[PDB]
Design a protein around this ligand. Structure first.
Ligand SMILES: Nc1ncnc2c1ncn2[C@@H]1O[C@H](COP(=O)(O)OP(=O)(O)OP(=O)(O)O)[C@@H](O)[C@H]1O
Ligand SMILES: [Mg+2]
Lengths: 519, 296
């Protein structure tokens, strides 16, 4: 009912999920019964009891055949496109019809045949648990949610997600992209200022990396490019640390059998490497300790920031080549980017943020935890933005939302080139920024001449050009020429340009006037 | 309204117009571009309010065609250059260093010419199709050898330096010496130039000159000759290097083997330079432009 509903924001990734709500028009991320705000997207079964989150990851080693994880991608996907690389730990998907299925023991009695649950069933159960934990935290029953999704989910995947939510008794008001949630999480803050910026969203997760280029003008954003890399990531860093520590164990015990063959040892090493890497992110030094890893023997060591960075250097330039690949795909230059937001768990590490600081000029602002005091948690950005959207959209009806989310509303003539005025001294000044959608009225204040009097406001077209590096403007076709009579010495002239839908351009040059229309 | 501290041009004498305004140009559909917005944020919700007032029911189907103008999603062929790999390349027994590459990833007709995105895309296709997890029931346990081959190829080729060294050591795509006596009548001004571009892989300067034709000017032909004479190869041959224990009794052992590796690589590099110059000289001897130029 429009009068009564309960909305939340959900971020649902391959590695982990998160839930959030809004208190006093401010987004706050919800902790579950375990106290976690970043809840691993892992499900595990012991004696027929359903567990999720930290308990499941801890029980991962104990239960080989009853844990399911990294199933987010599998949703709404055909057998041909299944990606099983990260699913070695998870139970082997069995092609039943068109819907792969996991076979696990979800009953309490020990002599029961294991069930063959679908991926949709598993997502449904996970959404029930998430909603339930949100329900205990809020004291009320959660009824609605906005869930974030990547931009490359197919329509079949969206249908699978909505069907899973419906089976989980959760109606999805809207699906939003993680870059849009990240930008909204900042823009909807009290202290935020709307302004024309080139925004790069770098969402660095566990199994994936996303770099997205957006232009945000007048508080509205237009997608210029997006890239998704599945090769370089925190899991790959986990493997290189497991390798190096394995080395050290092999040297310390001459003859010790190789760790890789034993699954239990593999899982223990990965979980402990994850703990250690997070600790080394926390502070300068970190320690690694495994108990009864093999044959009851024990091991420990210590590692530090610089050594970890050296052993992990190659992935850092892999992230670099990804970011330049994305900028080249967007046809832009690092001098063209205004802000780069670091999102996702991997973004926290200071080194990567400093590396992008070295790649980009100082005029670019890097919003990352270690390089900016006013930054927000990259693991909380998506969930808080989703909660803020689920809050602000409450007023409209369900049909109203279906209509507001149709292509007839979102699509409109964005003006490619820039519109500006020519300044001369004894240069192109942009008023309408490039790639700006139809009626985005803008206003500039210019200086009068040395003595003033009659003054010429000549509005022309403009294009950006890079000179080796420094960005300059290039004057193109001339649009209009107006005159202001008797301007005072030192006065300011106000110039407004409005490029309304119909493509009509209204020009105003009033001193603090001449007005004109271009059909 | 943004304040900018920049001065306006003084109006020239004797200029006027109706209401002091002159319309010269306008914006065009070529001067614009259609992109699609993400339906998020309060300003989008206000825009949606305005559009719902203007049009009510949205013509999604009608405006889908207009939205089609720009697309930011793409799909590619399942197998662009499907390779038979007879008998799984004779079951492709694991043999490190010896095993060829590029053919297993099915990037043939590209080899040295490729981009990271294409390489990753091919990698993902190959792994998905041949992954033991997906098709294990159909006797894929035997195809574990091929699966390890796939991973070895992926690691060898993804990393830039390893791929570059493997390319130099054995491209397996070098054409034989141009314009042999049997291959007579092939144009000396075209076949040789083609060989130069085919063998300009290691050139330290991107604007490499070309052989030219009968009318080619003296300055260009001379610059071409000078550039080739004074080259600067980055190439080297280390994929064939002798193996060493990954855990090595410290720095000393690597240096001890490096000794042999260094003398081998230096002599080999010298021989490669020898061959390169020997070709340059054959071309200089064959080329007739110099003979007419000196007599004049
Ligand atoms: N407490 C933590 N704080 C920060 N990062 C963490 C923490 N615990 C784990 N990580 C790491 O952070 C990364 C998760 O980042 P991110 O939030 O972008 O992923 P996700 O939302 O689960 O999934 P996706 O990559 O599909 O968007 C992983 O590499 C994970 O190992
Ligand atoms: Mg993420």
């Amino acid at each position: 009912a429009p009068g009564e509903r309960v909305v939340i924001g959900i971020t649902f990734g391959n590695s982990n999920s998160s839930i959030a709500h809004t208190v006093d028009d401010k987004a706050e991320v919800i902790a579950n019964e375990d106290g976690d705000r970043q809840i691993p997207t892992i499900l595990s079964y012991v004696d027929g009891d359903e567990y999720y989150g930290q308990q499941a990851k801890n029980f991962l080693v104990r239960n080989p055949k009853n844990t399911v994880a990294y199933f987010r991608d599998i949703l709404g996907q055909d057998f041909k496109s299944v990606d099983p690389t990260h699913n070695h730990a998870s139970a082997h998907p069995q092609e039943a019809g068109d819907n792969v299925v996991f076979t696990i023991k979800d009953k309490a009695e020990e002599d029961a045949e294991p069930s063959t649950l679908t991926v949709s069933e598993i997502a449904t159960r996970y959404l029930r648990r998430l909603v339930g934990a949100a329900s205990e935290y809020l004291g009320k029953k959660v009824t609605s949610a906005v869930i974030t999704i990547p931009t490359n989910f197919t329509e079949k995947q969206k249908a699978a997600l909505i069907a899973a939510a419906a089976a989980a008794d959760l109606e999805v008001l809207q699906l939003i992209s993680e870059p849009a949630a990240a930008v909204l999480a900042y823009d909807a803050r009290p202290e935020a200022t709307i302004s024309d910026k080139i925004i790069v969203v770098a969402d660095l997760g566990g199994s994936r990396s996303d770099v997205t280029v957006l232009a945000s003008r007048s508080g509205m954003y237009t997608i210029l490019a997006t890239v998704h890399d599945y090769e370089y990531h925190g899991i790959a860093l986990d493997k290189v640390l497991i390798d190096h520590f394995s080395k050290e164990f092999l040297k310390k015990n001459p003859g010790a059998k190789d760790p890789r063959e034993n699954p239990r040892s593999l899982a223990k090493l990965r979980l402990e490497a994850e703990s250690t890497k997070r600790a080394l992110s926390r502070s300068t030094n970190a320690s690694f300790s495994v108990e009864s890893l093999i044959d009851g023997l024990d091991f420990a060591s210590t590692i530090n920031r610089l050594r970890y960075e050296t052993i992990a250097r190659t992935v850092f330039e892999g992230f670099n080549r990804l970011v330049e690949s994305a900028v080249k795909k967007a046809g832009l230059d690092p001098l063209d980017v205004d802000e780069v937001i670091m999102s996702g768990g991997t973004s926290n590490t200071p080194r990567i943020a400093a590396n992008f600081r070295y790649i980009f000029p100082e005029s670019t602002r890097i919003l990352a935890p270690s390089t900016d005091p006013s930054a927000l948690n990259p693991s909380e950005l998506q969930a808080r933005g989703a909660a803020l959207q689920a809050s602000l959209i409450q007023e409209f009806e369900t049909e109203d939302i279906e209509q507001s989310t149709h292509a007839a509303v979102t699509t409109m003539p964005h003006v490619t080139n820039a519109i500006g005025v020519v300044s001369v001294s004894e240069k192109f000044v942009p008023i309408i920024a490039p790639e700006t959608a139809v009626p985005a009225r803008r206003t500039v204040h210019l200086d009068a001449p040395k003595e003033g009097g009659d003054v010429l406001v000549k509005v022309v077209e403009g294009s950006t050009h890079i000179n080796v590096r420094e960005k300059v403007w290039k004057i193109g076709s001339t649009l209009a020429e107006a005159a202001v009579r008797g301007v005072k010495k030192g006065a300011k002239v106000e110039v407004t340009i409005n490029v309304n839908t119909d493509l009509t351009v209204i020009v105003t040059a009033r001193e603090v006037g001449v007005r004109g229309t271009l059909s | 309204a943004t304040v900018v501290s920049l001065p306006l041009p003084t109006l020239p004498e004797g200029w006027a117009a109706e209401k002091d305004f002159k319309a010269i140009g306008k914006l065009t559909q070529e001067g614009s571009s259609m992109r699609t917005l993400e339906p998020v944020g309060p300003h989008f919700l206000a825009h949606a309010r305005r559009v719902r007032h203007k049009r009510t029911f949205s013509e999604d189907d009608r405006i889908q065609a207009q939205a089609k103008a720009k697309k930011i999603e793409q799909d590619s062929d399942s197998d662009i250059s499907e390779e038979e790999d007879p008998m799984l390349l004779a079951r492709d027994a694991k043999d490190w260093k010896t095993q060829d590459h590029y053919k297993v990833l099915g990037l043939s007709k590209y080899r040295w010419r490729a981009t990271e995105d294409q390489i990753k895309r091919a990698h993902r296709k190959k792994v998905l199709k041949h992954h033991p997890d997906k098709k294990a029931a159909a006797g894929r346990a035997d195809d574990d050898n091929f699966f390890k081959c796939i991973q070895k190829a992926a690691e060898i080729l993804l990393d830039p330096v390893k791929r570059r060294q493997f390319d130099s050591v054995d491209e397996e795509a070098d054409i034989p010496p141009p314009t042999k006596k049997q291959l007579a009548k092939g144009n000396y001004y075209e076949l040789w130039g083609k060989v130069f571009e085919n063998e300009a892989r290691f050139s330290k300067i991107q604007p490499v000159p070309g052989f030219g034709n009968e009318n080619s000017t003296r300055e260009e032909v001379e610059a071409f000759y000078n550039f080739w004479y004074n080259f600067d190869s980055w190439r080297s041959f280390e994929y064939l290097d002798e193996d060493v224990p990954d855990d090595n009794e410290n720095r000393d052992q690597k240096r001890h083997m490096e000794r042999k590796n260094a003398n081998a690589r230096k002599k080999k590099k010298a021989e490669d330079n020898a061959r390169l110059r020997k070709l340059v000289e054959e071309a200089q001897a064959g080329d007739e432009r110099i003979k007419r130029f000196r007599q004049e």
